[PDB]
Design a protein around this ligand. Structure first.
Ligand SMILES: *[C@H]1O[C@H](CO[C@@H]2O[C@@H](C)[C@@H](O)[C@@H](O)[C@@H]2O)[C@@H](O[C@@H]2O[C@H](CO)[C@@H](O[C@@H]3O[C@H](CO[C@@H]4O[C@H](CO)[C@@H](O)[C@H](O)[C@@H]4O)[C@@H](O)[C@H](O)[C@@H]3O)[C@H](O)[C@H]2NC(C)=O)[C@H](O)[C@H]1NC(C)=O
Ligand SMILES: *[C@@H]1O[C@H](CO)[C@@H](O)[C@H](O)[C@H]1NC(C)=O
Length: 377
């Protein structure tokens, strides 16, 4: 096992799924979790057989069943549930299933053995009760932060199978932003218009690098450490207002991000950054079909035989919902101000007053925990 061999495969697949999601979200805010969807699909591997299993193993690039795959994955989850987790991130996977289905012998114990947790049984014939329960389990397993994951809308008598994934993150900066150096400021939407939003400021030695699109536009990559350095945020945007964020989105990969960090250098800057707080339900169906995982939504074609042996089964709904707060510090509404040794020495100014991209990486492993674009802060 090359170090973090699995971790790198997951984040990877996780990033690939993300492109998909960004392609479908031009001009909208999105926050997403590469890790989450990777974990949830790894689980699903066990409920599946035939081509349905194949489509996933081919898309994820490892087989959950082989030697040390599940072993390495729970260890990953442990590293991320580390003691350093001062309640910064809550995480939840859940596979829900209609209630009177003969589960194939061995499934439960096996699932518990490789994954802990278990498949949750509910009665979808009971209308709104069933979502209510799914929504409650989700709320409580994400420190109350994510509510209505399962939409008042769809899911009916006939729904028999549903995956859910949900994360919440509110991280504590290594150096958090002065409260006093936060002031209003114009943010330029992509359509050129203009909006007055609160931007944070902090002047500091950042890790920094400048890359270029294939179409020859320059763009900034900036690393923000979180406490004790387990995680970092990466911020990226094209220099030129005129350039849509897509130029970046459409080329994002796991490897690109490596190149970014690899290629960084500590440099003094003044950083103006919008304070922001996003919550996005992502529907997984299209992104997954697009990576080859078609069978799993399809009656008469999906192969759930590793789970149930009274045929008819297919995934009704595959939802991830994510909330991320970035604003000054996780801390008791009030962060360490105000210090500044600022004459006319002014270091260069990087201002995120245009749409931009963010990435939260768990540093030892390289896992992209979260990912997103800020369109209107
Ligand atoms: C930092 O980032 C660069 C990539 O970004 C470039 O450089 C930065 C600083 C900016 O100037 C950007 O605007 C640039 O785009 C990383 O560069 C990549 O690094 C690897 C080495 O790890 C190098 O791989 C080599 O590949 C060749 C042959 O294979 C290639 O295949 C591609 C297909 O995409 C082909 O088009 C390309 O021209 C190559 O022929 C082998 O000969 C070597 O054995 C080696 O494997 C990449 O090619 C290289 N890319 C570029 C554009 O330079 C650099 O590693 C990062 N630094 C750190 C510390 O990670
Ligand atoms: C800058 O670069 C490397 C790896 O990210 C690390 O050794 C260093 O602590 C980083 N410093 C930051 C983000 O301030």
């Amino acid at each position: 096992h090359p170090p973090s061999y699995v971790a790198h495969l997951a984040s990877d697949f996780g990033v690939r799924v993300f492109q998909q999601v960004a392609q479908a979200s031009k001009d909208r805010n999105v926050v997403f979790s590469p890790y989450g969807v990777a974990s949830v699909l790894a689980m699903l591997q066990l409920t599946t057989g035939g081509e349905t299993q194949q489509q996933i193993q081919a898309a994820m690039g490892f087989k959950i069943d082989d030697k040390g795959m599940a072993p390495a994955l729970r260890h990953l989850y442990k590293e991320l549930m580390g003691p350093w987790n001062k309640d910064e991130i809550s995480t939840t996977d859940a596979i829900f299933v209609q209630r009177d289905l003969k589960l194939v012998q061995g499934f439960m114990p096996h699932f518990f053995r490789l994954f802990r947790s278990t498949v949750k049984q509910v009665d979808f014939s009971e209308v709104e009760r069933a979502r209510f329960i799914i929504n409650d389990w989700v709320k409580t397993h994400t420190k109350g932060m994510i509510s209505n994951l399962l939409g008042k809308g769809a899911v009916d008598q006939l729904t028999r199978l549903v995956l859910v994934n949900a994360l919440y993150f509110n991280g504590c900066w290594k150096t958090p932003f002065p409260d006093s150096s936060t002031h209003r400021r114009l943010f330029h939407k992509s359509d050129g218009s203009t909006v007055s939003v609160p931007m944070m400021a902090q002047t500091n030695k950042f890790n920094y690098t400048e890359f270029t699109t294939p179409d020859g536009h320059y763009y900034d990559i900036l690393e923000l450490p979180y406490h004790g350095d387990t995680l970092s945020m990466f911020i990226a945007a094209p220099y030129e207002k005129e350039v849509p964020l897509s130029a970046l989105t459409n080329i994002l990969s796991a490897q690109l991000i490596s190149h970014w960090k690899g290629n960084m250098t500590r440099l003094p800057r003044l950083l103006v950054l919008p304070k922001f707080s996003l919550e996005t339900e992502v529907d997984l169906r299209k992104p997954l079909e697009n990576l080859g995982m078609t069978d799993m939504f399809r009656q008469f074609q999906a192969d759930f035989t590793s789970l149930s042996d009274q045929e008819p089964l297919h995934v009704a709904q595959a939802l991830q919902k994510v909330k991320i707060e970035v604003n000054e510090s996780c801390t008791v509404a009030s962060s360490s101000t105000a210090v500044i040794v600022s004459a006319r020495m002014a270091p260069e100014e990087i201002i995120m007053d245009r749409p931009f991209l963010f990435v939260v990486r768990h540093n030892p492993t390289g896992t992209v925990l979260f990912m997103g674009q800020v369109m209107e802060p």
